[PDB]
């Protein structure tokens, strides 16, 4: 009724309340979208989680390194929101490198094969999802999924930058794709936010030390942005990917909107 | 009922029913804004083409250029909104470049007294309406400005390109005033759109090469852009104009939403 | 006599004469560095084509993929230069999608683990031989890459335009443990050239659509750049490559140098 | 005899012993450069600065605001250099913005006839100088400015950051102009030096607390940058634009080589 109103939206990446996606979800509701839901392994611990959301929603399993699961989505997708009916939003929420490829380790000791699981989820699996829900995604519709920006290194993050560069190249593939069906493909960049990942990803570890680090770098963000920054709260990130999904940028594709308080466009 | 209700917003840059300031403001009211507009020096010819506007809105006198408008500026908003009440929005769409700093004329042989007065109306003048206006504005406001990408030269567009790289980099200083006050500040990038003077100029109002370089830039738009380009309707920009005046991309600021097709993400 | 005087350089990826490695190394030579080459899998082609070169250098095996060539590396190297020697510089210059990432095999048909082996030999090896060589390497000291532009998405070039944008990534990271040893790490983006592979691909190779849309890029390519582009010699890259090794741009690093022939500052 | 060997440039922005335009005149000599200097209007003081350099050249009044200066420049400096020889180089090293710009006043408090002295000589002149110049140097030629990056915002640079976002626009421009002469346009972007007007215009000020202000930045950026910074030596600048003087780098035109220990290319 106000926003996503009348619109169907797939959305993956649901695995605690802290997820963004768990936010994007609750925010697309309230704005009055059926969802579809989208999660991975613990099916049983996100049911449990997925409850707690406003409304009802069918969940689905995807392993996004699973080819049968992608090759049997857009069926299974098909079968929960009716015949005949087809989406009109995607929201790609998912992320992994192995510890190996963040903060603990030297950059130089991730082993290929960890950071290539890594690429796998993080990057490529947005062209998976794309190829596999296309198919049914009607004209005006909208793809999008979770970045941050890439375009300098930093410490710790390491080869999950490496993963979101790759992603943001693509994004602007997936988007030639797309835009045969009328379809937008975009990413949104966010600010760092205290999901379960986040504090967990590091601080711990690196170092150790602290969560007092990402006490530090919440206190940071929020200076560097213009409009400031709070990382305990999901929902201006939410309120980004809405925006996306809905029909009031209907001229933006291949690229990344920063619902980062505006903290890229400052040197400090 | 929509994007925008209660909202109070200043537009500027109405000059003629093709104006894509026109379309912004056309598309504000219809999703529920209340609005003031300001024009510049033809102030009949502003009158009749308000007064087609799907509501009646005030219109006041602004020349980005006179001292004196900008010192009244904010006393004048105020008694046409009613005392008490403040702007929720204001939209910058103003640009000029004269003759000698666009199309034919070598790009040398622009007179720095004529670039200068293209950047005075074209870049300065985002910061003189942000110092105005923001005295008046009400946290979660919104300052949208228009743009096109300067980030690669080109022919024709001249010095008026250089005034748009000048005013990407005005923007991101704006946000951080913007920000004390709880407001945003982005820029709209438009692919072209054909105005009364766009038009005029592929026509070969600056010289015939100039013309036919235009077109050619405007032919490979649409064909670049995953999503297509329709160079005549200035709508899908004037909705991206509403997204940023909307509460929907709060985490905004400092910088440059690109309502041009996808095209600046592909190469070829 | 000249730029390089007395410096101590690995050169990989040579595979044929008109490899641009193999014109990196010709320069280098010619101004006074002493080289030690690498090649990949045809070693006996490697060595007449290498034979060429102004002055005899000695040749290494090294499969980019292998453990245990790596894990060699620097023993092999400093046998051949002497022990209690070091190098000034490293350049890779090797690249490999597999025939699914490329060409006409549409985006999204390409099986990851073709995308997978591709990042591996034309990103995450950037890391590698930086890891490999810096305990050899002397402050001062320079290692350079290649690479072409991944900003915007492209046909024919898929996820070898993916791979590249996580090679600039990459790049960045290189960069801060090079700092650690005195060494910069910069990337050289070179305009499209003529090598065996480049031709038989715009010859058709990989379907006559994916060669035509090539032979399009490489005409506008020479158009754009102001000083224009000879996609036939690939000197002035071997040039800017020597640029790099050389002393004299010091305070550069997790950088990339455009030897491009201007082409991507301009949009027409 | 080592460089710059057999090629004449015109060197401007000398005003102290510590001006990057004096380091970058003593390395162009070094390198074996006959120079031609360029001057503003403390003619007296800058030509006893200027015999301080290891060789004898002329030197020449330019108020790159001053029409007749640059309508004459051409002339003037073929009678210092010898009628039939052309330049080889042109370095473009001249900065201001008035106080009222720069980190005392708040940034909307310039008014825009300082801002416009500003953006005249700090971005316009740089296409002014190369009209001038560009009708006598040779193919292979080389113009290079200097930069800073202002791709993001920044306390106190305010409206300087504004005009090098502009002379990053000129510059390719320019460099399209110039390709016609078979002749190179770029700029050096350095990490922050301690010259006279840099120690001055901020600290002193804003804000008055500190020239331990200018201590700090010069920490922080030997932090960011990967290879370190230090703010007191030149130098490294220097070599920089001594290697775009060259013809080591002869596909690069339009664009920005940053020479600021790679600052730019970290978040933290
Ligand atoms: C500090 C400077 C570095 C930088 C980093 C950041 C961030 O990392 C921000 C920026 C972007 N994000 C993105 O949101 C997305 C959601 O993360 P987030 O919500 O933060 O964490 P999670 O809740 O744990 O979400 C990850 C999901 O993934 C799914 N997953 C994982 N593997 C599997 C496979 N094999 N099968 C099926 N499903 C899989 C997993 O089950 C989860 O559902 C993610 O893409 C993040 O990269 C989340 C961030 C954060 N701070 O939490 C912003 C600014 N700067
Ligand atoms: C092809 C590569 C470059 C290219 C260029 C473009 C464009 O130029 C696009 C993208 C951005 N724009 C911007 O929209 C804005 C609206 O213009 P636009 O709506 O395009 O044209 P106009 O209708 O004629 O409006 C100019 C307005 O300005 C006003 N103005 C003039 N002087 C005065 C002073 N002294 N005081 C106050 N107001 C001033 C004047 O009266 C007009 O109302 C403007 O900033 C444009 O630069 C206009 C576009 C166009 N196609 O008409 C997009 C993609 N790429
Ligand atoms: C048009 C838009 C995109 C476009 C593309 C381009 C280009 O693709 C340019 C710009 C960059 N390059 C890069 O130079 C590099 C040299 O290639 P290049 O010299 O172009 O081709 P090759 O001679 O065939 O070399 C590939 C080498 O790699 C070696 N290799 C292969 N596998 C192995 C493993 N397993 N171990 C060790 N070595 C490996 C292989 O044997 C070869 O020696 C390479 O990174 C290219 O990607 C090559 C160019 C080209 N025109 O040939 C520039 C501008 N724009
Ligand atoms: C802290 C983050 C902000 C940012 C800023 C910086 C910098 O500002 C660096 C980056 C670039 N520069 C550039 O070098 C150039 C030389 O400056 P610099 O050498 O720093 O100062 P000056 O010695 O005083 O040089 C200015 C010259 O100009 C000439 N000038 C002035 N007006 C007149 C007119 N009317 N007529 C003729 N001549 C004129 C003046 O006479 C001087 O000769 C200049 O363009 C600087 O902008 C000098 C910097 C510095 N730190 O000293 C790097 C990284 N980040």
């Known amino acids: ?25 609750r925010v697309a509701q309230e704005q009055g979208a059926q969802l579809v839901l989208t999660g991975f392994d613990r099916l049983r611990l996100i049911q449990r989680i997925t409850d707690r959301l406003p409304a009802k929603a069918p969940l689905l399993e995807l392993d996004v390194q699973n080819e ?34 963040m903060g603990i380790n030297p950059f130089f000791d991730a082993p290929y094969a960890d950071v290539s699981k890594g690429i796998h989820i993080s990057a490529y699996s947005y062209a998976s999802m794309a190829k596999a829900l296309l198919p049914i995604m009607n004209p005006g519709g909208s793809i999008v999924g979770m970045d941050f920006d890439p375009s300098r290194a930093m410490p710790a993050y390491n080869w999950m930058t490496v993963a979101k560069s790759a992603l943001e190249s693509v994004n602007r593939f997936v988007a030639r794709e797309a835009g045969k069906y009328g379809v937008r493909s975009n990413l949104v960049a966010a600010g760092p936010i205290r999901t379960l990942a986040m504090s967990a990803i590091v601080g711990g570890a690196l170092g150790e030390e602290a ?58």
């Open 1 to 25: 009724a106000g926003l996503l109103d009348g619109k169907r939206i797939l959305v993956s990446g649901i695995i605690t309340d802290s997820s963004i996606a768990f936010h994007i979800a």
């Open 211 to 268: 969560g007092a680090q990402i006490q530090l770098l919440e206190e940071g963000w929020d200076q560097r942005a213009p409009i400031g920054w709070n990382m305990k709260d999901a929902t201006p990130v939410a309120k980004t990917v809405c925006a996306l999904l809905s029909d009031w940028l209907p001229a933006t594709t291949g690229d990344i909107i920063y619902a980062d308080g505006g903290a890229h466009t400052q040197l400090l």
């Open 68 to 101: 049968e699961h992608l090759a049997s989505l857009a069926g299974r997708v098909t079968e929960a929101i009716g015949a005949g009916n087809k989406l009109d939003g995607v929201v790609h929420s998912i992320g992994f490198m192995p510890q190996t490829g």
